[model samples]
Target: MRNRREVSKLLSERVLLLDGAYGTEFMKYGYDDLPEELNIKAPDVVLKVHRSYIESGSDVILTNTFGATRMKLRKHGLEDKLDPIVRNAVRIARRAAGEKLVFGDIGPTGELPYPLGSTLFEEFYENFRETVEIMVEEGVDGIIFETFSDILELKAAVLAAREVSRDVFLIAHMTFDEKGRSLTGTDPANFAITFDELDIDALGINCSLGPEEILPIFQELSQYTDKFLVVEPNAGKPIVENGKTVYPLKPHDFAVHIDSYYELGVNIFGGCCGTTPEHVKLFRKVLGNRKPLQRKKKRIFAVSSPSKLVTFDHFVVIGERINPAGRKKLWAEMQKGNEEIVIKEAKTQVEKGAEVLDVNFGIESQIDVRYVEKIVQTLPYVSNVPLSLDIQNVDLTERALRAYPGRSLFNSAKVDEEELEMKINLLKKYGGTLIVLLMGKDVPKSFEERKEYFEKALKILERHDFSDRVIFDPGVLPLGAEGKPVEVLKTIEFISSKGFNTTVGLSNLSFGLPDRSYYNTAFLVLGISKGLSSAIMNPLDETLMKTLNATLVILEKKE
Candidate 1:
């Protein structure tokens, strides 16, 4: 149907209303059996809630498939009936949605991943794909993963839908506990960066509390994601009244507090558990024709592990000590399958003011990619610094990307035909920015040449339907070895002028020098002056770290 503009267009124009509480209303109607099964058994009963919300002035209606997964329905003996049940649910919602929208509803599988539960990511990913595919097959306008308390579980759901249909609109709305963290230690800031990297159409908190209780968390969510913000909180805090759970806020009260979230930049408004068609009607009236506040997309660069977020608004120093380039002892340790060497390297750089940590298992025959995978998984436990997941092999690169629990960076994509294509597909599936070099068999002849080669790689990436999460590196060179030192700075400067972030292989400039730290430090200072966004360097070197931090102040001063 392709006309899912309510999320993007209506958000900037006015608050779009979302249908509220299918479960609550279904219970109110005395259908104690599964609400999803009613989609096939008693279509009119389920349609009653869908049409009520539509008539109550909702711009969007979600299907009655929140717990309609194979995992949940298998217990209800309706597992094999997924296709017909979810499809009919979509038809029911769509029939009532004449000019509005219908979003396919996918909820948690009620099974956590990893140490919390034995369910694997791919298993849940498969289940979620089935839900999304069934919904897409029935022509739902978009999809939503709502009321999630575990971020990793949420990750599995988001990835499944994106994998099934890259063109479909997706929304990620999370629920947080009172202390403001998901069950798996994911905070709103982490959720924002993680969802932003996944290219979510809207990201926000929902289902945990009333609008008043959620306002602060919503404010925090707005600070991290510049995407369309959605808020569908419970009407109020729940309490036991006469041995039954109920939310306390009335329709007007919920709308009054929702306006506070609108003041903080929420563009899409809805209600959670305890809300009714009456609540939707009041929200419809209060949020009428009110344009969203100024929330332009974030014009900054960042990387996040699922648990944390690190941004680079100024100079970024990626610790280079993780490499086996000149570290004989560390190389020996890695050969023996000792990942602690790199783990220590990660800690050292963060202590020395490195914002982003770079990892390279040297990606050679000596170090097995399996060991690279282990180290990649282990490093996050040691430090919260965002990792640049660097390795040469495409197959192994994808291995590391899938294993990593956070948003990571691909070491690079270059001129080789296969290398460029693999990176394009890998990045498109698992989101990350590329650290690309302008290389095509020889040293670039001029500034225009480096820029041209970079553009060619960008075009190749674009051709494969890959996104532009590129961090262009202007091909680091040794002192007069293959090209002039002046050429390197000019190339970094050229990329910066386009408002793109740049990184350099800082040690290459002093390849033959005895006191290489001095050369590295001086080059970093010059690069920062040219608006170098980050450099991959040895953060342990006192002089290099000093120059990097000093140059950071200069960069910030000029800005």
Candidate 2:
């Protein structure tokens, strides 16, 4: 079989044709007892279908192991058959296709990720790892995760695939409704942008609306990422005839619609529900030999929740009241593992217009990792907003990342080499945005000193591929202690002029100052003028928020 690089090479040369709707084909054959189960019980049936697709001009055929994850199999009492199901499916596909590529097919585990469901990220990771490891062990060319409606669940599968083998040709596809949103409320932009942070080879949509209905959604998706695009739209709407369901689009009609996708830059073609070999064959024939379009990379700066995306088109407010630093009762309650107060704080912040919440449980020695995990899981439920994980403990940070369902912000990583490298790796694995402080071991005293750290951090970051995903935070000093506000503002202006996003702890400038709100408000206005993307502060401050909204309007920052 061709390796991941070889497959990627093929994708660049021409559009690849993947087989259509295996499960739907199984239904037409009158055997619907879990299509994956047929992989081992009736290998001949599965082999015949694989053969038909390849003969009909399929460049890629997925193994019949979509629902073979132990978690999904456990529901059908076939958990123990996971090995045979995956191995036999691969064997059958390999035998049928002498030289064609066979990608291991993975789907959702029928459980929502945490805060929505009890499935922890590690649990999702383990469930997918078991199947992906087996698929690779059985010698498949790649892995394709399709028909996922939850981007977070898909993220776990994608991470698992990369963890198993970095060289596997990986594709992540999610299904969306006619309104261009997933079940978890992620739009096409969020879906594409979220996975853009991961190490996947291809990204696209599949298995929701028919070819005609999903075209616009596909258009929105293609704009946010540069990965090889794939689509497997269902054949037109299903119609009932004498208790039998049929798709409206005939083979030729399906080909005509697919041609539109071709014009819009789809790299791979396939069918979902109501598509057969005839549909694939006709589409392949009509769409002659054409090379895939080169997609321009769109580097977006944002974080996401299950239902919302916080893109930094305007000033983003990251609520700072969730921290237990000065609130004695809040700290005591959190110490006891009670989260009502935290949830209340989160909901209040979001209601008060905080696009993201900064979560920090102060003093690592007094906190429990379990409490951190619990809060991370529960926060997404209280409000569908992204979180800035302001956690300090490295172990706690990793744990929080593992529990968080959506893309988060690693609130602040130091410029220190070892620490920054570790945070970079974690952010890569558990996709998120990052804030790198302009200091190493101690806070910088002047703009010149901060500039030195900034240059060093940029040098270290240059070695990585995620330069766009990082935001710089020039350390803010307490004005009451004769700290130079001008130095901080100058640093912000300097970084912003260099085409980088910046953030600051707004309250830090007002530390020990009377009338903190005026100081915070004035400093925030100045910060925004200097191209600050976000700030950690109390959204409940009426004067600060009122001034913020006016400033955004006056500067034409928010429309």
Candidate 3:
């Protein structure tokens, strides 16, 4: 079994050239009716197709077993041939690949499983396990599950393969219909998040549409994941003409889309269905010396405040000025029920480049739940960035989220399953982003407890389908509040390493400290360097502004 790291290294060094158009190549051998049967009756024809792609510059050749699962093979009276077919397909491709890699190709079983079919989970798992065992025994370098529509089926295949051997690289690819939705009606974003959680080596879209049609989907998937992306588009939509199916996407026309794929961060390139050697040659030529963009090791989800933008690349630091919390003068005005300061603050931060704004008006001395509605109504108009409505009252949060226009964010959700689900549903209802804190059922007193809270919070979000629109804040505490500050840094590092976006309330780091602006500025700068995306802060502070501007310059330089 090949190690995942080894395969990743190969993909990182260059755009791994995958073989294109198995069905197209097989058509040349007059074996279109029963491609799987060729494994036993006409192995030479299958080997020749593999040879053609290898000679045409394919670094990785997939087995011609696109429809080789037991259920599909059963239709042709070859139900018992799963082992020999998979084994021989891998063997032939391995020989064609020589010292190169050969990926065991397993396509959809041509029948839906479970809720949609009579096939149960165990039956599907057994079919996949049997095929994978043969491929692994024959020493295939990797496994590619292609053209899958049902997410559940894909998950089962992934589990079966990884359960047997985590050593080999695994790719789970799905097909999208013309509507840009999977056959199972799964959106691209959901598909990405689901597969990312499955722990597959790579996730991508293959078959269904050509590069032109798939580019937009690629763009959306990029926002949802930093995992390795592979795109093997059909040459083009096929047309029946003169009693034959033909694809009009020429080599040059197809090559033009390669650069776009590279820009969208696709690491592996190949073709599907109707592609040819000319297409593969063009792809290699176009990709040339340009390497795939490196996957980001961290995730940054920033909130836009009126005066400043708060981003959580790795750390959580809220810009304090955006919130009316703990500010005496601001609290007095808010108590007087004035909203001009809040509106102006929101506008100022957005101009300064905030992506998510935190709105808090539930201060004990002044603002109340009524202020929540006021702020939510006023801020969204002035600031185009998403808002995180910060309030303790669940009803108030629900109300504000509903009234707020565009994508507003919820400041936090508690650990209780009911509360977390409520917050997620509200956010989804309002079409808003969500910020989940690392405190819950049992308050975490230690840094390790906080980290555990954060991890659990992430899983909960995934469970409710909020993984794509959620940001994490590990409850950053004041530096002088015992060992609180240590937990903040540790949480930042943990979240950054997992590549989930995080945020923190910046002012908390200087809650009781003197010369708080200086401390706040220093902390904000450090947070950004550590991958902090958004922070709640007073945009009026000169030092904080200087630090932010300088950090922007540095970050942009690195980019």
Candidate 4:
């Protein structure tokens, strides 16, 4: 109970100060027998660092379990000792930070997930879960994921922390090089965009290029959102002197630059890599009377896999080829319970630039319960794209939603009350974005008619606390089957003018026509002109893929 109100209440009051480098202090304290092992192997050494930071007027102190994950511990022949190591680390922090906050420290797993044939995402997630499990069970007040260069690995840690406890304040910290990009090619704005999808308590950059270099990156990130920002840069890029690494920035210099960041709306402050208790004390002294910059709360729409969040600031293409509708070969294999056969399509779409994948297990009875369940369960591990679960059966919706590891998308929320209510109940259990369909048995034949149905569906979505997640598809039928031309364009433009996002089933517009890519590409180009943010298309189509990319080049990532 003592931990319940500290982080949020204190954050509202002033700029919170986190402890200085735990790894540096642990290493320089004495002999380095894996540093983290000192929690149980030599308790006094670990306690000394924590006590020193707390005495420096730091508000939050992190436990020393940065390398306690199995991926790192097993390398040192100590995987079996992970639980005790993390438990003792938390105990030490608890003892040191009497009335101050104590957070469980989590770091990267040391295994890269994006290098061709790297580790599976589930393995990456479970590894972080194990460390967070022990830390949470041992009573850490908050959790800080720090020094992460890989975006996917950071995703796993955030999801695991959210899964364990909703109450623990989460702060996701990424490191950057001088070029202002993560090792995985994420720029400052993209990193902030990813966290916008998570809606975490806080997000920020840490551990590289010193305070001065991080300023431009931080200011670029500020344009994306007004969420809580934390900066804990290293003293400076390291330099070797007498065979020992020294940070370039001194305590006064470090604290001086932090004041600039504080003026630009950074809500939390601290040190990394080369920071000592004296550095943190220097910050406490200089900023003793200064107030943190306040920002208004903003909402950004997002979709996510367990490892990362892909926000929709521009055109996002969701590949539509994974359905079993006309693919007899797919269901033929799925009926035999071949998950690899179905999962192959998702991986291929992801390779072709589909930020999200649509999963449809046949129209009706074509869905094999075992086959669909395994496909949804295995999709996130293999492909980083978030899943869009498409099925008429609410049973399939609940099943796939339960097995899917990350936030997914609901394919359709029909205008009918019973069906929409059923989908809403499922959405409460399994969080996801809703593809709200405006047409039901009756198709809207005109622009005004479609808005009537669109507003109706929007009301139901709002009543269920889901207006923000809506991606409206103003129901377009296949041509020659009740489809109205320009009605689709009309709705897209209308939605854009209304300041909401619109999407279309681009392939459905070209259905019943030969050389369909000819019609599909033009319709998509027209749709984008009318303010459509997403288009469901065949990513494998070379011409259509080219059209999509060429169009997005002018439309996307424009700062």
Candidate 5:
């Protein structure tokens, strides 16, 4: 077993490259019909692929036993040879690895375990234990459970590997389908949070989509866990031509994508299906000796309302309610093209000690682009606090962002590239801070995917040069929604663990509920304890105001 710090240090110093597409590589040797059985009948061919990648400057070579578990081998009538085959697979990779690291690849068993199927947990555990024990005895350098879709099975494998060999590093990689949902409907955020609790050496995604698709998920994954980031996307989307799968992305193009991932904080890089030595060589050439950028430390503060004061020692938040998004009177005033009511709202919030105000003009009945510009100009003159321009319309948001004075905070954009690119461009053009929401155009179905979404969003912000001015919101859902409220708290914990600042629309929790203030206050206190740095809410409400002041005391943000 390797020390956690040492493994992490090595990854940070250099981007580690693992072997590419074992199944596809095996096809070149006429083993396409039953690739998994090659472990027992054709070990040399498998070793040849490993050697090719090692010779191509690969820092690590994954074993050819990705599907060597008893369940998968049973398909080839070779279930009886699982132990010897797995042992031989690791031994061959060890011999081929030489001074290079060998990662024992434990791919997911095709069948769901136990309650989802007839296979019991102990049975699944034993199967993993047997295969892992063989790899441990053969002295492999690390273990990677790749292309895993089910968190339950992945968890069992992690437990099994750790039970057998606590010394070796473990990397858990998952695959998300086109919808950004795993096979079992697990999202990336939930995956990171769950695995972070398990304490793996590294966590990431691989083998599902192209770089364009994977990039967003990768960004989301970054926000949930500070664990080392690993990514190995397929060469491109697979295509069937003349009864054979073809991938169109050439080595050079693939390398460009690899550079993008590297820029986004992927410490470990590799190729999945459709990859070859050519791809590995190209990746090595492009990445060369470049080191991943050091993640900068950010200062985050949790404030009672949307506004807060920032001293040299502390930060502040300003309540979000002063804006008239749903209020009829506020909207009517804005519709009449009057800035008085809007300015009055801003003044009231400022008088309540709001150091910042989140201005949202997304009224339902009107598409007043002019109001965005008007509000941006009016608020700064009447109020001393800085303002956050919150609007969904990209064009209007951009207009408001440009109109604001000083380094204003722009509300949010999703995790997808186009929106992220648009927001990044706005930030670059306008020169202001940014607020990021964890949920993208694709809402993660599970906690794992949610974490992945957030991580992917962080990566996007980092790439766009807005990392310094970025604040994240993991997204708070109302209790009326179907998902568990605890998941929201888990998200907050996950966000804080990554050491990034976070905020929430404090009113979101009360949506679709009666007497929402009670829920609002409770959740606000909870967010403070969970390291919530800022919130958007009404500072004028007596209970909410008192809660904010008391929370500041309890948080020691003010004496």
Candidate 6:
């Protein structure tokens, strides 16, 4: 197996060539039933294909296990043969490579998780883990998750690979249609932003379009992250001639288009679906010793539902009506596992102009973990708005993070280092932005105390390279009880000046006060003036919402 650091050094030095498609290349050898099965039925034939790519100047060759996942194999009655197939595939690749890197190729499980299909997120994670664990045991140099149409499924596979072995280099890919979106409708920028925080060593697009069509999409994706990029475009559109499939683009033309990707900072190049060894040969001749271009990507602060992206370009309203803090009827219904009330509340908030919904399962011992998981998974299915998960229980928080299909707001972690580390780990494993409450054992009442707490938290977050994914909260207190609304505004202004976003719980400023709507609305406008990006409030309050809109227009911040 190759050393991870050595591989990283080599990638940073110059461009590396990856082999063309194993399934498509095997079709040319007249053994097309199951490309992976050739490792058992005829080892020599599989060896021949691997050797052909190596001979054509490929620096890395992938094992022929694209369709060997347990779920996909079960469909063909070959579930029990997973061990033998993967073992044989690894053995053959090692024998053929001699010195080049061998990457274990894993593809989608053909089943969507949660909202899209009946599968659970854990089920998908377990299925990929089983295969990845074996590949690591067999000593594969790296893992390649490719041709994924669903970002959530790809996320599970990448998480599994990283958990299995931190030493193995990981590369992730998602296939996109001509419209520059996945089959599930994730565009290039959204895809890049979603995976930017994951631990993958490289990210790229593969298997949905030819070089001519995919270049523009790849170009757009490159603007969001500074990760090492990989590309494996199809040779061209498939055309049938005399009952045989053919790719229209010749080897020279394919290599010519590949040059454009190299200039745009693609670190590794390969072929997908309709390419051959001749294509790899031409790629090596034209793009052998070139170095990868340096890229500068702007950090984007946003959260996503599976189909929608909510960027904090201006003020965002996170509805606070989903909590059981005041509603006894809704609490009883939720305790009974009723999803209708939750979905109805979610729909109402979004319709009332809530960009994100804050979901709190309440702080009570009677809350069932199963009920929390059920409700957390159900919101992303019925509503398009991203969620602010205000869960306090450690177990329930992890459950929600795993079940969420897109980037979410992990509602808050206090200034306690232990709790902050735990929440940060969850956000790293699953993707999200975290809200950091600026307080210690007790809520700070003064501006100086809160600022000191923020500086302390910033040191810990900076160590993890995660300062950008955090939104600060100034610990809003009641105005009648030494609240200091001006202090909170000053905190928001200070955080904004240091290049971070801030959020406030609007109702907290007027606790136990009469006509609270007027106070909440006025404070929100003042906070917005001080550069507050989001607020958790009652979006259904007509006066407050109308005032918020009018404020945005008056400040020239309306979109």
lDDT tens digits by residue: candidate 1, 1-559: 5534544665678777898998778888988778899999889988899999999999888999998989878978899999889989998988889768888888887786653465655677788999999898888888889888766577778888888887777889888888887765677877776677675678867887887778888888888777888889998999999999899789988888866887888877889889999999988888887878888554446677645666767667787778887878888889889866677778878888777778887637788766776676666545656788778877778777765666777777776667777786777667777887888777786788887887787677667765347788887788757657677789888878877788988888888868888888888888888878888888789887766666666666532
Residue-level lDDT tens digits of model 5 in 74-183: 87788898887787887788888888888888998888643235454456667888888888888787889999876656766876788887677888888998877776
Tell me the deviation in Å of residue 374 in model 4: 10
Over the stretch 1-559, how does candidate 3's per-residue lDDT look in tens digits? Answer: 4678899987888778888886667777677758877888899988998888888888889997877888889988998888788888888888889988889889878776432455544567677887888888899888999988876567668767887787889998888888877765565765665456455789989988888999998777777677788889988887898998787789998889888998888888899867898888887777777678867523334333222233444323333466555667877788787777777777677566555567677554345655555566556445545566776777777666544433355777766678888877765543456777788775566778987787677678778877767767777667786635656767777776787676777777778979989877777777666666566676667778767777777778332
lDDT of 6 by residue, 1-559 (tens): 7756777788899889999877766776787778877878888888998999999999999999998889999988888989999999999999999999899999898887665677777788889999998889888888889888877788788888888888888888989998998867677887888887788888899987889999999998888878888899988877899998766678998999877998888988999877788888998898869878897687779998766788988888999999988789988987787778899999999999998999998764677776676667667657777899998888888888877767889988999989999999999878899999998789888789899999999999988777888999988999899798888999999999998999988898997899899999899999999999999999999999999999999999873
Worst 10 residues of 1 by lDDT: 1-10
1-559 per-residue lDDT for model 2 (tens digits): 5667988899899998888878778877888879999987778889989998998898889899889999999999999999999999999999987888899999999998766787877788899999999889888998999889887688788888899999999999988988888898888888887887688999989886888888999998888888889999888877898998777678987888867898778998988888898988887798778898888766678898877888887788999998887789998988888878899999999999899999999887788787788788778656789899997877888888866767888888889888888888988877888999898878888999989988898888988766777889998989888779888888998998998888888888887869999999999999898888789999999999999999999998764
Off by over 4 Å in 4: 114-121, 197-199, 242-245, 297-318, 328-410, 416-433, 441-449, 513-533, 539-559
- Candidate 5 residues lying further than 4 Å off, grouped into runs, are 1-5, 295-559
Off by over 4 Å in 2: 243-245
Positional deviation of residue 100's Cα in model 4 after best superposition, in angstroms:
1.7
Per-candidate TM equals 0.76, 0.95, 0.57, 0.81, 0.54, 0.94
Cα lDDT tens digits for candidate 4, 266-303? 87888888999999898888777556677654457776
Worst 10 residues of 5 by lDDT: 302-311
- TM-score winner between candidates 4 and 5: 4
The full ranking of all candidates by TM-score, starting with the best, is 2, 6, 4, 1, 3, 5
lDDT values for all models: 0.79, 0.86, 0.72, 0.78, 0.73, 0.86
Evaluated against the true structure, the overall lDDT of model 3 is: 0.72
The parts of candidate 6 lying over 4 Å away from their true place are 238-246, 480-482
lDDT of 1 at 358: 82
